[PDB]
């Protein structure tokens, strides 16, 4: 589990925190993906395992600072110039990278704060009929083919059920995440991708986001509500 | 390659922990402890402080590792190369079992084991520390029993000084490689001290010889 | 004096088997494969060198994906390698550094190791809570652990220096079956491709074919003059090769119940430490004490290549299930990937 | 002591009462298996350099 | 006779015995030194598998010794012409740098070797015995730097001095003046002697206080500790004692008569040709006489 942060502040500065619990936090790289009140998700910052490489979003490159404390198992985000364009619900995401790992596998609860080139993923469809028991398919596309020379396409599928954090379904566009029922399936061709649900149940409703992981300024697709 | 680059720096973080642990491991002295079971190795282990037993002790800012393999009871030559690289071998022989039998008397069982270990192909230069234990019992036993029971060719007075020095010479005579390996023989009392110092001195001579190997002198 | 009668009966019983074995020896393997084309000189280059072990490497095992492998060494570390990018996927510290064998689960979620501690430890690779942790410690052997091989995700078979092999149930940790009949230490084992039978060479210079289900010895193969150090099953599943301390290798046929070909050379006086077949079964690769892994034409019993890239004794050997590489560990603390 | 001798004899008889085939029948199977999979062995027949996962 | 060199009254002699003595001596040292250090250097790079801190320091000694050997033909060509230098001015300043700096390089990387062995016998558990190969290479750089920094001023010294009908190059001139390069020559010997002799004495005493001398291979290494302390004295004492007598003559007689220096000047450059005897004996003593 993980959580933490502050909520209310005017134009100024604030610091967020995340408290990891029981997953060997020292060997996990952590992210700070955020979500606007009714837009889609957007990545913010990243700090690697052992506090090596650190990356930031282009829109918060100078104002934001991300740091971790491996003892006491805490992750921090320092924000200095808090404009009105950055009021959002900020999530904490864990991700580990070796040969066959599943990054972005766990997402935090998230906290809201208010103030009072790149690859674009389209996800053209926005809403579909909610009739259950059918075989609903969700499409996606990318500006450039995210198929690397090592042979895997870095496309991730997330499902955000109404009222809770996003949950990873498929990583690298074909691999099914642990604990996810075998109804979900993922197919693609480098540029155009698909997520298939065989027999949709009552718990499959919500927004389905697509994420890329080829070049590190990584971006989402604004979602596809059901 | 964003995931490939994050995997490469995970391996490099593994690399430095492997090198950190190797630095710590090289600062420990590894000793192999042998004997005939009832030879008093338990007493020797207590002095310094199934499967294979590891004992940890320190002396003068030096870290020692003693491995006891007396519970194997298997073919020794199939696992004796695992210890090729120990600083020294601590061999324990009880002086009070010259007349006791296992048939074959217990003392000649140790001599058979000592001869096999000393002349092993894997131990051609490792120092052997020989501990002759139970010197109290042997001193009293020779008064009522003669050493001729164990050694029929023995011709000497049944005194502690003459008889004990004869047993040691018999053990040191089994060393065929008299020029490339040194055997340190010590007489151990069941209730005494300064046995850990004797191991430290014999280990230091091995370290000095190891240092001269690196500098090219020896 | 029933002991004298029983001993005399066994000697006649043993001679009857030898007569039956000699009866079926219609010809030799060399004569049958005398018309086959020689494999010719075979050259393999070190495509990769895996560094990071700081002591002698005693065991390695490939994963079924032909990309990941695990290696053991006496620095107390079990390292999982990425054989394509040389990356270190995992580094597992062992409780006892005296490790003599490695196994990779065919599922890929577990590895096993054991040695002078008389214990086989099972490690869970796919843990949701971060790192790699130990799962089950299988205790019950009286001697050291010489080999271990996963039958499935829940069943493992181990050989020990107490002259017995055992079949375990990892969930409960109890010996389902005990395989007895060897008089010397069992140094190796090799599961059949169908995972129903397995062979085991021992220090009594004899190899025994066992049945996992029933739990009794089926055949006993002799002919070696010293300890059998390595054993491996032919890809077909009806034959196996042995590597012994008399600097010789032998091929035994399960159905014919006798040795077929001998892989020896007068120039070699060092015993074999490991054997392994290629994917086709035409090549038999053996690791020797003379620092060189030798490649044998298994059908013709001719030397075909040398893997001379190590500065110490080649302790372990391996061939991928894809058959596209050979990994060779040795006492110089390096693993080399060939061709 | 007598039981161990009897047990060894009983197992020795079981290994005797098994079915065997001629070597030429068993040797031809290894000959047949090797030639059937001669094209699928990368070590026996080196695959094209572009297909090596370890060369490049 | 007499020569005015850079505002000191200095005396310069041109003896006929120099031509018939020094070129023979320096010729034998050059060929054997080329075979000794040249072959030794190849073994370090292309015949040695492992490298430790001790072997790195022995490599720096061979590097300094080898570079000094190749400068001998320039010295030989200067003496066959009886102190007539006809190679130029800049090349003259360069060799004086390549001789004085190279002579410390050999001397510095054998006091280091002597101290290195002292810590391997008398303090076998010290941390200095386990310094990394990178730490050894760093120290060899600082020791080369102090070697260079103590001889750069030789290049700045304009010394293509004309002597009658011959151009003469030399950093060793007999005249009443305090020169750092003259006190350089003394400290090259006395200070290392207080370390080489001390380190060699404690190594032998410690190997005897413990009964380690009984081993045949250890007693072989005991002699080679003595040998390096004797070759150093043999090859460096004759030049140092002669130069001290020259200093004594200046203080008690003076430069008013440059005739009393006829014999010492001839002898000094004969003894100075023995300081290169060490540079070619080192490969036989330090590298070729090692079991490894
Ligand atoms: C460049 C030649 C000058 C001749 C005098 N000279 C010297 O100035 N420095 C020396 O080291 C040296 N060695 C020998 Cl023999 N002659 C030497
Ligand atoms: C050289 O000697 C003369 C006579 O003693 C003296 O006057 C002169 O100062 C000396 N030159 C130098 C540079 O000392």
SS3 A207: strand
Give residue A219's Cα distance to chain centre.
Answer: 9
> Residue C316: in which H helix or E strand, if any?
strand C316-319
Q: Using CA atoms, how far apart are residues C136 and B124, in angstroms rounded to an integer? A: 40
Helices (H), chain E: 16-19, 22-46, 53-69, 72-79, 90-121, 133-149, 153-156, 180-187, 190-209, 216-252, 262-272, 277-282
Domains of chain C: 2-338 (2.130.10.10)
Decide: A66 and A10 in contact? Cβ < 8 Å. no
DSSP letter for C113, please.
E
Pick from C245, C308, C254, C339: nearest CA to C24? C254
Q: Do chains B and D touch (3 or more CB pairs under 8 A)?
A: no
Decide: A74 and A68 in contact? Cβ < 8 Å. yes
Q: Using CA atoms, how far apart are residues A15 and A6, in angstroms rounded to an integer? A: 7
Pick from B9, A99, A94, A19: nearest CA to C128? A94
Token pair belonging to C165: 């092999």
Q: Flag whether B5 is in a domain.
A: no
Q: Using CA atoms, how far apart are residues C271 and C188, in angstroms rounded to an integer? A: 15
Q: Using CA atoms, how far apart are residues B218 and E212, in angstroms rounded to an integer? A: 12
| Shortest-distance atom of ligand 1 to CA E75 | 2
- Which residue lies with its CA nearest to atom 6 of ligand 1? E170
Q: Which residues pair with C178 in a beta bridge?
A: C166
Q: Using CA atoms, how far apart are residues C1 and C9, in angstroms rounded to an integer? A: 13
Pick from C59, C136, C133: nearest CA to C99? C59
Query: Does the beta carbon of E98 sit less than 6 angstroms from any atom of ligand 1?
Result: no
Resolution (A): 2.8
DSSP E strand stretches across chain A: 14-19, 29-31, 34-35, 41-42, 45-47, 54-56, 64-69, 74-79, 88-90, 93-95, 106-107, 111-113, 137-141, 155-160, 166-171, 175-176, 184-188, 192-197, 207-212
DSSP E strand stretches across B12-126: 28-34, 53-58, 63-68, 88-94
Nearest chain B alpha carbon to E54: B215
* 3-state secondary structure string across E202-251: HHHHHHHHCCCCCCHHHHHHHHHHHHHHHHHHHHHHHHHHHHHHHHHHHH
Nearest residue, CB atoms, E129 vs list B182, B211, B216? B211
Q: Which residues of A105-135 are buried (b: 16+ CB within 10 A; e: fewer)?
A: bbbbebbebeeeeebebebeeeeeeeeeeee
* CA-CA-CA-CA dihedral for C76, C80, C83, C88, to nearest 10: -90
Pick from E154, E151, E155, E161: nearest CA to E6? E161
Handedness of CA C244, C248, C253, C258 (dihedral sign): negative
Q: Which residues of B72-81 are buried (b: 16+ CB within 10 A; e: fewer)?
A: bebbeebbbb
| Largest interatomic CA distance in chain D | 67
Total of domains in chain B: 1
CA distances from residue C73 to A33, A187, B31, C103, C111 in whole angstroms, order as listed:
42, 42, 19, 13, 14
Pick from A52, A152, A150: nearest CA to A102? A152
- Which residue lies with its CA nearest to atom 1 of ligand 2? E9
Can you spell out the DSSP letters for C39-98? -------EEEEE----S-EEEEEE-TTSSEEEEEETTSEEEEEETTT--EEEEEE-SSS-
Decide: C82 and C67 in contact? Cβ < 8 Å. yes
Q: Flag whether B38 is in a domain.
A: yes
CA of E84 to the centre of ligand 1 (A): 13
Residue given tokens 């110089």 in the structure block: C332
Decide: C161 and C144 in contact? Cβ < 8 Å. yes
Ligand sitting nearest the alpha carbon of E254? 2
Q: Using CA atoms, how far apart are residues C67 and C86, in angstroms rounded to an integer? A: 10
Give residue B177's Cα distance to chain centre.
Answer: 17
Decide: E291 and E272 in contact? Cβ < 8 Å. no
Angle at the Cα of B133 (from B129 to B139), degrees rounded to 5?
135
Query: Does the beta carbon of E272 sit less than 6 angstroms from any atom of ligand 1?
Result: yes
For chain C, state the CA radius of gyration.
20
Q: Which chains touch C (3 or more CB pairs under 8 A)?
A: A, B, D
Nearest residue, CB atoms, C239 vs list D1, D30, D55? D30
> Residue C219: in which H helix or E strand, if any?
strand C217-222
Q: Using CA atoms, how far apart are residues C159 and C143, in angstroms rounded to an integer? A: 9
Q: Do chains A and B touch (3 or more CB pairs under 8 A)?
A: yes
Q: Using CA atoms, how far apart are residues A107 and A165, in angstroms rounded to an integer? A: 7
Token pair belonging to C192: 């059949």
| Shortest-distance atom of ligand 2 to CA E8 | 13
Token pair belonging to A208: 């389905």
Helix then strand count (H, E) for chain A reads: 0, 19
Q: Which chains touch A (3 or more CB pairs under 8 A)?
A: B, C
DSSP letter for A52, please.
-
Token pair belonging to C68: 């990941």
Q: Flag whether B93 is in a domain.
A: yes
Nearest chain D alpha carbon to C38: D44
Domains of chain D: 2-47 (4.10.260.10)
Q: Using CA atoms, how far apart are residues C69 and C63, in angstroms rounded to an integer? A: 5
Decide: A43 and A33 in contact? Cβ < 8 Å. yes
Contacts of B201 in chain E (CB under 8 A): 210
Q: Using CA atoms, how far apart are residues B155 and B143, in angstroms rounded to an integer? A: 15
Pick from C93, E152, C277, C132: nearest CA to D41? C277
Name E275's Cβ contacts closer than 8 Å, sequence gap at least 6. Answer: E103, E235, E236, E239
Nearest residue, CB atoms, B74 vs list C74, C88, C144? C144
Decide: B217 and E224 in contact? Cβ < 8 Å. yes
Decide: C145 and C114 in contact? Cβ < 8 Å. yes
CA distances from residue C155 to A71, B53, C133, C166, C190 in whole angstroms, order as listed:
39, 28, 19, 11, 15
CA distances from residue A200 to A181, A193, C223 in whole angstroms, order as listed:
11, 19, 65
DSSP letter for B18, please.
H
Method used experimentally:
cryo-EM
- Which residue lies with its CA nearest to atom 4 of ligand 1? E170
Helices (H), chain B: 2-25, 41-48, 106-118, 135-144, 160-173, 195-215
Per the document, the length of chain B is 218
CA distances from residue B79 to A178, B74, B90 in whole angstroms, order as listed:
43, 9, 17
Angle at the Cα of A35 (from A31 to A38), degrees rounded to 5?
170
Helix then strand count (H, E) for chain B reads: 6, 6
Q: Where are the domains of chain E?
A: 21-285
Angle at the Cα of C162 (from C156 to C168), degrees rounded to 5?
20
Decide: C33 and C42 in contact? Cβ < 8 Å. no
User: How is chain A split among helix, strand and coil, in percent rounded to 5?
Assistant: 5, 40, 60
DSSP letter for E85, please.
-
Chain D contact for C284, CB < 8 A?
no
Token pair belonging to C72: 């053991």
Nearest residue, CB atoms, C87 vs list A23, A25, A99? A99
- In C102-141, the residues whose Cβ lies within 8 Å of chain D are none
Decide: C275 and C232 in contact? Cβ < 8 Å. yes
DSSP letter for E74, please.
H
Q: Is D25 exposed, middle or buried (0-12, 13-18, 19+ CB in 10 A)?
A: middle
Token pair belonging to D39: 């094209």
CA of E172 to the centre of ligand 1 (A): 7
User: Are residues B205 and E210, on separate chains, in Cβ contact within 8 Å?
Assistant: yes
Q: Using CA atoms, how far apart are residues E186 and E241, in angstroms rounded to an integer? A: 9
Q: Using CA atoms, how far apart are residues C120 and A179, in angstroms rounded to an integer? A: 30
Spell out which residues line ligand 2, taking CB within 6 angstroms: E 7-9
Per the document, the length of chain E is 292
Pick from A159, A196, A163, A199: nearest CA to A179? A159
Decide: E20 and E269 in contact? Cβ < 8 Å. no
Nearest residue, CB atoms, E290 vs list B61, B211, B216? B216
> What residues make up the domain containing B62?
29-212
Q: Using CA atoms, how far apart are residues A221 and A120, in angstroms rounded to an integer? A: 7
Q: Using CA atoms, how far apart are residues E13 and C161, in angstroms rounded to an integer? A: 87
Ligand sitting nearest the alpha carbon of E184? 1
If one counts every other C-beta atom within 10 angstroms of the C-beta of residue B102, the result is: 10
Token pair belonging to B214: 């690196």
Q: Using CA atoms, how far apart are residues B36 and B49, in angstroms rounded to an integer? A: 21
CA distances from residue E229 to E107, E112, E197, E260 in whole angstroms, order as listed:
12, 13, 6, 34
- Which residue lies with its CA nearest to atom 11 of ligand 2? E9
Strands B28-34 and B63-68: parallel
Q: Is C153 exposed, middle or buried (0-12, 13-18, 19+ CB in 10 A)?
A: middle
Give residue A156's Cα distance to chain centre.
Answer: 9
Q: Using CA atoms, how far apart are residues B57 and B49, in angstroms rounded to an integer? A: 6
Angle at the Cα of B29 (from B25 to B35), degrees rounded to 5?
130
Q: Using CA atoms, how far apart are residues C306 and C323, in angstroms rounded to an integer? A: 18
Token pair belonging to C42: 């075979």
User: Are residues D20 and C256, on separate chains, in Cβ contact within 8 Å?
Assistant: yes
Q: Using CA atoms, how far apart are residues A43 and A36, in angstroms rounded to an integer? A: 11
**Gapped junctions in chain D, after residues (C–N > 2.5 Å):** none
Per the document, the length of chain D is 56
Strands B127-133 and B183-187: parallel
Name D43's Cβ contacts closer than 8 Å, sequence gap at least 6. Answer: C42, C44, C278, C279, C283, C319, C323, C324, C326, C339
Strands A45-47 and A41-42: unpaired
Q: Is A19 exposed, middle or buried (0-12, 13-18, 19+ CB in 10 A)?
A: middle
Pick from B182, B187, B193: nearest CA to B167? B187
**Gapped junctions in chain A, after residues (C–N > 2.5 Å):** 116
Q: Which residues pair with C326 in a beta bridge?
A: C319, C338
Q: Using CA atoms, how far apart are residues C102 and D3, in angstroms rounded to an integer? A: 38
Residue given tokens 């075989």 in the structure block: A135
Nearest chain D alpha carbon to C218: D15
Token pair belonging to C71: 């290696």
CA atoms within 13 A of residue C160's CA, in its CB half-sphere: 27
- Nearest Cα of chain A lies from the Cα of B70 at a distance, in angstroms, of 39
- Which residue lies with its CA nearest to atom 9 of ligand 2? E9
Q: Using CA atoms, how far apart are residues B93 and E26, in angstroms rounded to an integer? A: 65
Tell me phi and psi for residue E115, to 5 degrees.
-70, -35
Nearest residue, CB atoms, C131 vs list A27, A99, A178? A27
Contacts of D28 in chain C (CB under 8 A): 32
Strands A88-90 and C133-139: unpaired
Helix then strand count (H, E) for chain D reads: 2, 0
Contacts of B17 in chain C (CB under 8 A): 91
Residue given tokens 């304009």 in the structure block: E158
User: Are residues B17 and C91, on separate chains, in Cβ contact within 8 Å?
Assistant: yes
* CA-CA-CA-CA dihedral for E146, E151, E156, E158, to nearest 10: 180
Tell me phi and psi for residue A91, to 5 degrees.
-105, 155
Tell me phi and psi for residue B58, to 5 degrees.
-130, 155
CA atoms within 13 A of residue E42's CA, in its CB half-sphere: 5
| Shortest-distance atom of ligand 1 to CA E99 | 11
Pick from C177, C178, C183, C174: nearest CA to C201? C183
Pick from C100, C13, C4: nearest CA to C56? C100
Pick from E173, E170, E174: nearest CA to E250? E174
Per the document, the length of chain A is 226
Query: Does the beta carbon of E78 sit less than 6 angstroms from any atom of ligand 1?
Result: yes
Q: What is the domain-level CATH number for residue B40?
A: 3.40.50.300
Angle at the Cα of C68 (from C67 to C72), degrees rounded to 5?
140
Decide: A189 and A173 in contact? Cβ < 8 Å. no
Strands B88-94 and B28-34: parallel
Decide: B167 and B98 in contact? Cβ < 8 Å. yes
CA distances from residue E249 to A171, B26, E258 in whole angstroms, order as listed:
92, 60, 11
CA of E156 to the centre of ligand 1 (A): 17
| Shortest-distance atom of ligand 1 to CA E22 | 15
DSSP letter for A177, please.
P
CA atoms within 13 A of residue B22's CA, in its CB half-sphere: 16
Chain C contact for D7, CB < 8 A?
no
Pick from A157, A212, A152, A151: nearest CA to A184? A157
Nearest chain C alpha carbon to B80: C116
Give residue A105's Cα distance to chain centre.
Answer: 9
Domains of chain A: 1-115 (2.60.40.10), 121-226 (2.60.40.10)
Q: Using CA atoms, how far apart are residues C56 and C74, in angstroms rounded to an integer? A: 6
Give residue E219's Cα distance to chain centre.
Answer: 28
Ligand sitting nearest the alpha carbon of E99? 1
């Amino acid at each position: 589990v993980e959580s933490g942060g502050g909520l209310v502040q005017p134009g100024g500065s604030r610091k967020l925190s995340c408290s990891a619990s029981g997953f060997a936090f020292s060997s996990f790289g952590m992210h700070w993906v955020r979500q606007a009140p009714e837009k889609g998700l957007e990545w913010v910052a990243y700090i690697s395992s052992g506090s090596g490489t650190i990356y930031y979003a282009d829109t918060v490159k100078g104002r934001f600072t991300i740091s971790r404390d491996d003892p006491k198992n805490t992750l921090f985000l320092q924000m200095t110039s808090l404009r009105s364009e950055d009021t959002a619900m900020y999530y904490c995401v864990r991700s580990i990278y070796y040969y066959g790992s599943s990054p972005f596998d766990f997402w935090g609860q998230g906290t809201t704060l208010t103030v009072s080139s790149d690859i674009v993923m389209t996800q053209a469809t926005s809403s579909v009929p909610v009739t259950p028991g059918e075989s609903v398919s969700i499409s996606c596309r990318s500006s450039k083919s995210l198929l690397h020379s090592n042979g895997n396409t870095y496309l991730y599928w997330f499902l955000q059920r109404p009222g809770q954090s996003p949950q990873l379904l498929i990583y690298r566009m074909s691999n099914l995440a642990s604990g996810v029922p075998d109804r979900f399936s993922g197919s693609g061709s480098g540029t155009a991708f698909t997520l298939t649900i065989s027999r949709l149940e009552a718990e499959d409703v919500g927004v389905y986001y697509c994420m890329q992981h080829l070049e590190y300024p990584l971006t989402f697709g604004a979602g596809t509500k059901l | 390659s964003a995931e490939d680059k994050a995997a490469v720096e995970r391996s490099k973080m593994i690399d430095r922990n492997l090198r950190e642990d190797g630095e710590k491991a090289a600062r420990e002295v590894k000793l192999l402890l042998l004997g005939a079971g009832e030879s008093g190795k338990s007493t020797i282990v207590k002095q310094m402080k199934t499967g294979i037993v590891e004992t940890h002790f320190t002396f003068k800012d030096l870290h020692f590792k003693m491995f006891d393999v007396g519970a194997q009871r298997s073919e020794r030559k199939k696992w004796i190369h695992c210890f090729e690289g120990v600083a020294a071998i601590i061999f324990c022989v009880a002086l009070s079992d010259y007349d006791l039998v296992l048939e074959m008397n217990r003392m000649h069982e140790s001599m058979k084991l000592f001869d096999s270990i000393c002349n092993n192909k894997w131990f051609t230069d490792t120092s052997i520390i020989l501990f002759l234990n139970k010197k109290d019992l042997f001193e009293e036993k020779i008064k009522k029993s003669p050493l001729t029971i164990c050694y029929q060719e023995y011709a000497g007075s049944n005194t502690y000084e003459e008889a004990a020095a004869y047993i040691q010479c018999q053990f040191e005579d089994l060393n065929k490689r008299k020029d490339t390996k040194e055997i340190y023989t010590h007489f151990t009392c069941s209730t005494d001290t300064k046995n850990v110092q004797f191991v430290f001195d014999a280990v230091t001579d091995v370290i000095i010889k190891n240092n001269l190997k690196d500098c090219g002198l020896f | 004096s029933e002991l004298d009668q029983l001993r005399q009966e066994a000697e006649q019983l043993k001679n009857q088997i030898r007569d039956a074995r000699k009866a079926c020896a219609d010809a030799t393997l060399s004569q049958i494969t005398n018309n086959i084309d020689p494999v010719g000189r075979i050259q393999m280059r070190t495509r990769r060198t895996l560094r990071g072990h700081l002591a002698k490497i005693y065991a390695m095992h490939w994963g079924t994906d032909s990309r990941l492998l695990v290696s053991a060494s006496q620095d107390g570390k079990l390292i999982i390698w990425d054989s394509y990018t040389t990356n270190k996927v995992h580094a597992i510290p062992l409780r006892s550094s005296w490790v003599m064998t490695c196994a990779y689960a065919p599922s890929g979620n577990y590895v096993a190791c054991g040695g002078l501690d008389n214990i086989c430890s099972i490690y869970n690779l796919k843990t949701r809570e971060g790192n790699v942790r130990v799962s089950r410690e299988l205790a019950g052997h009286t001697g050291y652990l010489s080999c271990c091989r996963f039958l499935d995700d829940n069943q493992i078979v181990t050989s020990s220096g107490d002259t017995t092999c055992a079949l375990w149930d990892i969930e409960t940790g109890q010996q389902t079956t005990t395989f007895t009949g060897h008089t010397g230490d069992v140094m190796s084992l090799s599961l059949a491709p169908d995972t129903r039978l397995f062979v085991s060479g021992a220090c009594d210079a004899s190899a025994k074919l066992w049945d996992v289900r029933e739990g009794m010895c089926r055949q006993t193969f002799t002919g070696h003059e010293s300890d059998i150090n390595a054993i491996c099953f032919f890809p077909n599943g009806n034959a196996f090769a042995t590597g012994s301390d008399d600097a010789t290798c032998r091929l035994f046929d399960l159905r014919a119940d006798q040795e077929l070909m001998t892989y020896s050379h007068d120039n070699i006086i060092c015993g074999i430490t490991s054997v392994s077949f290629s994917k086709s079964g035409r090549l038999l690769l053996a690791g020797y004490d003379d620092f060189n892994c030798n490649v044998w034409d298994a059908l013709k019993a001719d030397r075909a290549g040398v893997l001379a890239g190590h500065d110490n004794r080649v302790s372990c050997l391996g061939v991928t299930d894809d058959g596209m590489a050979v990994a060779t560990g040795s006492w110089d603390s390096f693993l080399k990937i060939w061709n | 002591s007598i039981a161990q001798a009897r047990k060894l004899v009983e197992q020795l008889k079981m290994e005797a009462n098994i079915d065997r085939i001629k070597v030429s029948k068993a040797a031809a199977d290894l000959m047949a298996y090797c030639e059937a999979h001669a094209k699928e062995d990368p070590l026996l027949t080196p695959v094209p350099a572009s297909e090596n996962p370890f060369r490049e | 006779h007499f020569l005015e060199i850079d505002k000191k009254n200095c005396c310069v002699f041109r003896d006929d015995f120099i031509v018939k003595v020094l070129p023979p001596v320096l010729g034998l040292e050059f060929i054997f030194g080329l075979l000794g250090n040249g072959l030794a250097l190849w073994i370090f790079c292309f015949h040695l598998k492992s490298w430790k801190s001790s072997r790195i320091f022995l490599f720096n000694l061979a590097v300094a010794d080898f570079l000094l050997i190749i400068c001998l033909p320039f010295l030989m060509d200067n003496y066959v012409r009886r102190w007539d230098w006809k190679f130029g001015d800049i090349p003259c300043r360069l060799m004086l740098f390549m001789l004085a700096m190279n002579r410390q390089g050999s001397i510095i990387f054998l006091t280091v070797v002597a101290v290195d062995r002292y810590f391997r016998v008398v303090h076998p558990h010290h941390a200095l015995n386990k310094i990394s190969n990178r730490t050894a290479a760093i120290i060899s750089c600082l020791l080369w730097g102090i070697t260079i920094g103590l001889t750069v001023h030789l290049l700045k010294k304009k010394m293509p001095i004309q002597n009658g009908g011959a151009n003469l190059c030399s950093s060793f001139s007999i005249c009443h003046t305090f020169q750092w390069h003259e006190a350089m020559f003394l400290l090259e010997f006395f200070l290392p002697l207080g370390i080489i002799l001390f380190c060699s004495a404690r190594i032998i005493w410690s190997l005897r206080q413990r009964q380690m001398d009984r081993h045949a291979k250890i007693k072989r290494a005991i002699t080679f500790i003595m040998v390096v302390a004797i070759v150093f004295v043999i090859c460096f004492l004759p030049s140092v004692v002669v130069r001290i007598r020259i200093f004594w003559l200046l203080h008690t007689s003076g430069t008013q008569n440059c005739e009393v220096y006829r014999s010492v000047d001839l002898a000094f450059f004969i003894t100075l040709s023995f300081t290169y005897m060490n540079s070619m004996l080192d490969p036989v003593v330090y590298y070729f006489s090692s079991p490894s």
